[PDB]
């Protein structure tokens, strides 16, 4: 039973909120490798844990730059939420300290790559081949949704290839337990709810909507509003106008005409029969819920493994010294990290 | 077509989280 494994899951879920791990290593027991993504505020290295040889992705973030950028509340909730949750399409969370420069999380490798790397090259998904990515998302937000939280930040640069072909949701920076509203602007352009770009208080509907914007761009191979500028954007996301590609499916195009709502009293994930109305779609007919969570339905694609710690379905990005200053900074802002 | 409007647009890269 569904509403039974999700009670459980609260459970779990509670008990790592309320007490949540702190300093469970620290950055000499790691070696640092390369790096395999960047943001505003830090990068993601590939590491090696010397203990055990297992490599691993860590999340550095300067203090001083999140500071800066007033994003500390949302640092201190990716940490505080990833720490406590658990299932199969998000990467685990294996450690987290900090030192007088950097915040640390310590994740799983997932070697196979960002799915927008593999979408932009190849071009566009085949329905069975994005159904069977968003049937892990439509769990995952489930899952998520369950235990109050919103992931606010939906995207297949977030999105990871692991070696059987399987997602994993990775960047909880934007991640949020509520219970009702929230106003944050946060997000990124192509994916923002109509409702965020409005400025009007607003809730977990902003992921399903985002699902809808995912789920177009897997299909079609561009989003279904895109522009030069974000202005632009958001203009066209406010007006609402989505056309489909002529090769997207009858079930697809209603699909998203429900996701892609405006209407919030229409949108689908958020009437009264909630994530059954996306489960039981036409689109989500062939769909095996149990076995997807499962992990025993047949990816439609799976990335090429040259070995442990091998790099080949990441870009490369610029390499900067990661500088551990004499002094603390920002200790009590990231007291609870 | 829009592929091609696409493509030469510059939001094929990975695009950055916005805040305010
Ligand atoms: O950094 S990754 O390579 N890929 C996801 C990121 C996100 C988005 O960039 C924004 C970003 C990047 C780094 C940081 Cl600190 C902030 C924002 C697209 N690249 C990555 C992150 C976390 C865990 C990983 C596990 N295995 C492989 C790659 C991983």
Same mark, same amino acid.
């Given at each position: 039973?569904?509403?039974?494994?999700?009670?459980?899951?609260?459970?779990?879920?509670?008990?790592?909120?309320?007490?949540?791990?702190?300093?469970?290593?620290?950055? /000499? +027991?790691?070696?640092? &490798?390369?790096?395999?993504?960047? =943001?505003?505020?830090? $990068? *993601?290295?590939?590491?090696?844990?010397?203990?055990?040889?297992?490599?691993?992705?860590?999340?550095?973030?300067?203090?001083?730059?999140?500071?800066?950028?007033?994003?500390?509340?949302?640092?201190?909730?990716?940490?505080?939420?990833?720490?406590?949750?658990?299932?199969?399409?998000?990467?685990k969370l294996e450690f987290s300290f900090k030192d007088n420069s950097n915040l640390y999380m310590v994740m799983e490798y997932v070697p196979g790559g960002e799915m927008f790397?593999?979408?932009?090259?190849?071009?566009?998904?085949?329905?069975?081949?994005?159904?069977?990515?968003?049937?892990?998302?439509?769990?995952?937000?489930?899952?998520?949704?369950?235990?109050?939280?919103?992931?606010?930040?939906?995207?297949?640069?977030?999105?990871?290839? /692991? +070696?059987?072909?399987? &997602?994993?949701?990775?960047?909880? =920076?934007?991640?949020? $337990? *509520?219970?009702?509203?929230?106003?944050?602007?946060?997000?990124?352009?192509?994916?923002?709810?109509?409702?965020?770009?409005?400025?009007?208080?607003?809730?977990?509907?902003?992921?399903?909507?985002?699902?809808?914007?995912?789920?177009?761009?897997?299909?079609?191979?561009?989003?279904?509003?895109?522009?030069?500028?974000?202005?632009?954007?958001?203009?066209?996301?406010?007006?609402?106008?989505?056309?489909?590609?002529?090769?997207?499916?009858?079930?697809?195009?209603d699909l998203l005409r429900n996701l892609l709502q405006v209407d919030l009293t229409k949108r689908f994930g958020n009437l009264k029969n909630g994530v059954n109305d996306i489960?039981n779609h036409k689109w989500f007919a062939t769909t095996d819920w149990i076995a997807i969570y499962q992990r025993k339905v047949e990816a439609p694609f799976i990335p090429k493994?040259? =070995?442990?710690?091998?790099?080949?379905?990441?870009?490369?990005?610029?390499?900067?010294?990661?500088?551990?200053?004499?002094?603390?900074?920002?200790?009590?802002?990231?007291?609870?990290? | 077509?829009?592929?091609?409007?696409?493509?030469?647009?510059?939001?094929?890269?990975?695009?950055?989280?916005?805040?305010?």
């Amino acid at each position: 039973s569904v509403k039974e494994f999700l009670a459980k899951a609260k459970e779990d879920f509670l008990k790592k909120w309320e007490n949540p791990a702190q300093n469970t290593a620290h950055l /000499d +027991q790691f070696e640092r &490798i390369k790096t395999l993504g960047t =943001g505003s505020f830090g $990068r *993601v290295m590939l590491v090696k844990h010397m203990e055990t040889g297992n490599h691993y992705a860590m999340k550095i973030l300067d203090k001083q730059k999140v500071v800066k950028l007033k994003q500390i509340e949302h640092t201190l909730n990716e940490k505080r939420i990833l720490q406590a949750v658990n299932f199969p399409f998000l990467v685990k969370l294996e450690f987290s300290f900090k030192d007088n420069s950097n915040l640390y999380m310590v994740m799983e490798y997932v070697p196979g790559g960002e799915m927008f790397s593999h979408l932009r090259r190849i071009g566009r998904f085949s329905e069975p081949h994005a159904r069977f990515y968003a049937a892990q998302i439509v769990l995952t937000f489930e899952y998520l949704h369950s235990l109050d939280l919103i992931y606010r930040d939906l995207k297949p640069e977030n999105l990871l290839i /692991d +070696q059987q072909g399987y &997602i994993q949701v990775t960047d909880f =920076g934007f991640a949020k $337990r *509520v219970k009702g509203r929230t106003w944050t602007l946060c997000g990124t352009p192509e994916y923002l709810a109509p409702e965020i770009i409005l400025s009007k208080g607003y809730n977990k509907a902003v992921d399903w909507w985002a699902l809808g914007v995912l789920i177009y761009e897997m299909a079609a191979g561009y989003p279904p509003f895109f522009a030069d500028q974000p202005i632009q954007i958001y203009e066209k996301i406010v007006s609402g106008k989505v056309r489909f590609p002529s090769h997207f499916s009858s079930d697809l195009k209603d699909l998203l005409r429900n996701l892609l709502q405006v209407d919030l009293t229409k949108r689908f994930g958020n009437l009264k029969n909630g994530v059954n109305d996306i489960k039981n779609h036409k689109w989500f007919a062939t769909t095996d819920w149990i076995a997807i969570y499962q992990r025993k339905v047949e990816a439609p694609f799976i990335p090429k493994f040259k =070995g442990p710690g091998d790099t080949s379905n990441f870009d490369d990005y610029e390499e900067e010294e990661i500088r551990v200053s004499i002094n603390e900074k920002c200790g009590k802002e990231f007291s609870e990290f | 077509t829009t592929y091609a409007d696409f493509i030469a647009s510059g939001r094929t890269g990975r695009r950055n989280a916005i805040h305010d």
